[model samples]
Structures are given as structure tokens and as C-alpha cells.
Target: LLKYNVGDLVWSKVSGYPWWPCMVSADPLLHSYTKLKKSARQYHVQFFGDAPERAWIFEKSLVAFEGEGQFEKLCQESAKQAPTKAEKIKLLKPISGKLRAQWEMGIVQAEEAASMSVEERKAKFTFLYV
Candidate 1:
């Protein structure tokens, strides 16, 4: 925020989302937690670039973004204010898991018309399954 530090890395945790870059600097900064879970321990984080400033937070909350985990770890790192959701999703698409793939795939395919045999068409397209 306004009084946020300007410190050292002290240490950095990478999120699975996009390695969202955040730097903890100066007096306003202190170490603690980032996760949604607990432990009085906490730290202040300020992204070097695009990342949004983080007040002291639990480690769980501060963690890298977790996805289907099919893609590379580096790519998986969390990013609060970065591109690469669709970017990573695009890459992880085929090299990856089921739920998200089906989720994303279902949308695109749904937009396109389906071609079926005359026999199926005779059924009046009652079997419209993607």
C-alpha cells in the first residue's frame, strides 16, 4: 500500500500460475504467511513488475497458483497480475489433464456445427452429444 516497503528477497515463493514475480523490500516489510491457512508467521510482498502488492498474508494465500498440474512447474508458478492463464492453458491444453481440457474443449467444439451421417440426421439429431 502507501506505506509498503521499497527489502531484500529475504526469500521468494513461486506460484504455480506463472511464477508471479513479487519482491519484498524495506521497514514496511516483514515475514509471516501468505496461504489462506495459519501461523502468525507472515511477510510483505511487492511485485517487481506487474504483480499486485501483498500485505502480510498467510503462506497458503501467498502460494503459487495451482492448476491441473499437467504442465511444467515453472509455468505452473502462481501469478496474481500476469498474463499466461490462456497462455499456459494453451500450452497445457494437449500436454495436460482432463477436466480443464474438456472444459475448454467443450466450449470451442460447441460453437462449431456437427456433421453427422444421414442415418443420425434421420433421428432428428436427438443424439446431440459432443
Candidate 2:
């Protein structure tokens, strides 16, 4: 079918449309799930005065948005979904094994310190201070 890019300009005559063209806010924003989740022809688009958070754009309701704030308000009416577990893991893979280990250790240390007794903390602090 027709391929649209992130900054493409297209027209809409669907519902709520007023014979005006709208910009393609985002694209290849994964109408598909890449390799993990099943891929589909889905996309996230933007309309006049859309919300800061992307969403609401779908293959169907590609018509007259409620007006200037149409896209933004549309997404607000819909439920927001968080990224999947796989995508989140991929973000961590950018670093090397050693660096990742050190980064993770900081998280563990933060948690570990929260549960430390005063005496335990003092000893740890002294060890680190030197």
C-alpha cells in the first residue's frame, strides 16, 4: 500500500475532517512488533494540537479530528499502554556486560542501603570513604 513517513503531509476527508491536510507526526513507529510481538499495519500519527504523548492515531478514525485539539483529545480518551517487556530489555542491552553490571549494582546498592541498620551503614560508609 502507500507508505507514509514521519513528517509526511496528507489530507483527510474522513469524519471530522474539514478539507485540510495534516502532518504525519510519527511513522514506522511500529505498526509492527518488529520480531517479538506479531507485526501488524498499525501506526501512531499526529493531528493539529495533538497531545504530547503519542497514541490515538489508528487506521480507522483517520478522519475529521474533533478540531485543532482533536488528536490530542482523542488519545486522552483512549487508554495509554506502556512498552512491552522486550522493548524495555533492549534498552539495557546498549551497554557492555561489565558496565551493565556496574549500573545494576548501583540500583542494588541503593536498595541495600535503604534496609541497612545505622551501624551497618556507618561501616559501609567508612569502607567507601577510605
Q: Per-prediction TM-score, please?
A: 0.29, 0.26
Q: Could you tell me which 10 consecutive residues in candidate 2 have the lowest summed lDDT? A: 47-56
Best by lDDT: 2
Task: Show model 1 residue runs off by greater than 4 Å.
Answer: 1-6, 10-17, 26-40, 50-52, 60-72, 76-130
Candidate 1 lDDT, tens digit per residue, 47-107? 3321234445434434332232322454444323337667545545343454345434422
| lDDT scores of the candidates, listed in order | 0.35, 0.37
Clashing pairs in 2: 15-64, 16-64, 17-64, 31-42, 51-72
Cα deviation of 13 in candidate 2 (Å)?
A: 9.5
Q: Write the per-residue lDDT of candidate 2 for residues 16-75, one digit (tens) a residue.
A: 222223444432334431121134343444332212223334444344322333434443
